[PDB]
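Hi D.,

Good news: the full-assembly prediction came through. Inputs first.
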Amino acid sequence: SGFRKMAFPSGKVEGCMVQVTCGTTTLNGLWLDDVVYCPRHVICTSEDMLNPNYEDLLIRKSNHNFLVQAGNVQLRVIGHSMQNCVLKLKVDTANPKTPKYKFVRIQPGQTFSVLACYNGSPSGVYQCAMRPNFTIKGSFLNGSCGSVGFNIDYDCVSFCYMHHMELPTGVHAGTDLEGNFYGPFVDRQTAQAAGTDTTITVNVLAWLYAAVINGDRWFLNRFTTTLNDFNLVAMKYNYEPLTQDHVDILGPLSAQTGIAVLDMCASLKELLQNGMNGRTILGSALLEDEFTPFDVVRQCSGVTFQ
Amino acid sequence: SGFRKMAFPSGKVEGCMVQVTCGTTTLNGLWLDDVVYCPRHVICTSEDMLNPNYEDLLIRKSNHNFLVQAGNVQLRVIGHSMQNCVLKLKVDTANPKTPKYKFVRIQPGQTFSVLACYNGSPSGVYQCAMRPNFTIKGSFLNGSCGSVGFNIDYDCVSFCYMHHMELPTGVHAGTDLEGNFYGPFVDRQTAQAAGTDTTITVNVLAWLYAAVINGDRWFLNRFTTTLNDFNLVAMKYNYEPLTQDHVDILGPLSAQTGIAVLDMCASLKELLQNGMNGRTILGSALLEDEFTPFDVVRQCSGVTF
Ligand SMILES: CC(C)(C)c1ccc(N(C(=O)c2c[nH]cn2)[C@@H](C(=O)NC2CCCCC2)c2cccnc2)cc1
Ligand SMILES: [Cl-]
Ligand SMILES: [Cl-]
Ligand code: NA
Ligand code: NA
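Then the structure:
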């Protein structure tokens, strides 16, 4: 019993974090096999952060213009290339701690663990979600660039996020490990701003199922809803639309608890209308939307507390 | 910017987790140098658990009653003993991944990271606090016994919790790594319950300072108060008394933000008396009390390990 924001154990990723320095700029890189991945804006000078031409900036660099430090060891850079917004530095030593890994590009609503790092050294681990507006609500200070997000289902590290920058509302933007940004953002100092964000409806429903599994039913009601009437109501509270794909994804949780998906939708509609009247759900006084259906099945018992 | 519930990186601890089996019971152990630590109730049958004589159950046991598995390798047990509620199994191999470490017993209100494990395999990491009633609000399923809690200082892991049991309200109880229970609990199947809990006042103040650092200011006001007057409000709302030592600890945050502890105490007093008026603080509709002052400074300054 209990229910917590639960990250993956971070050791497999800790063994890959290094420090990358170019000029006066230092940030983090990810060392896998004989390649170090980092944000290409490590080659941006202070003079001009507004309109960098990264092709022109990089052709001026020699391999020895990049200093890579793994703990106390300097790694020798022997080649470099740019892929989208990520710089790939070839080094002369393969990382002996390289885990089984893959690169995955995730969809909004998906969650992952973040290992926040400074100067190549890990500071802490937390859970995040890719918001509908393609930002993440991270906790990142100056120098956190190059920190990564990941999942480790079944002993394989799936890297899905590399941190690049902070937006004006204090939320965060970055890329996949192929260097393609999530959302419309660019690695320039522009007036760019996150769009209006929305609540991840399928995740709220998963978390309501988690509450039932852990023994609390107070928020249920005698009603049901059509999918279209649910979406017409939920969107008035700035909730994302619920699709038939989402309904299908919630099937296993519905089967374990005996609560039909559209009956749980009716409960959510009433919670939005009424609030909690001084009660809490899984320790929260707000509706939580950064646990996915997969996350709830991972964390919760397979046996409902009836 | 941003503010998240944040755990320590868990790698140094992952390399110490093993699986311990005695009879039909399997749970987790902590392998440091040539000793594995686990809950002593691993030696109990369900019958034994109703009224166990641990002294007699252990003398019955021998080294060959224990199976220790590190990944796919069996560790050979060459000795066994008990310290309080912790079983110690001497093995023939020192753990080559043993970190610099200490065993530390924490105080109520202090936080720590938990590495939840099953069958000797780490499964997840989360942050939690020792409650004033000496429980923790963990997330644990069957087989999680022997999972540990810890803090890190530079390169040294301070182990502070080993998980033993779940109470009827679904909160959790355990020991320090010397086998001494936190709270008035015993490792036996008998009627036991969490006592009435209170809110950790110094941690709520720390989190209000974190909120100010992150730009959330609507709860600040022109008033100040005194320790004595604030503590009358605290008692009324089942908050822990605020001591002069707590005020000293908050000093830094008070100097940085511009709000004296007693100034911020006046904000908390008003929040307790009037509520939040439909507003949130750092994305919560409740007053959060599982961040210590040290947690707030660490996260807001980027301390690494
Ligand atoms: C060159 C470019 C692309 C404009 C840039 C510059 C600085 C950084 N930031 C580095 O901290 C940093 C950079 N190199 C080492 N550290 C930080 C950052 O985004 N401030 C922004 C301030 C507003 C204008 C855009 C940049 C940062 C802070 C906190 C958390 N995350 C990141 C990120 C990107
Ligand atoms: Cl996805
Ligand atoms: Cl006994
Ligand atoms: Na030792
Ligand atoms: Na005040």
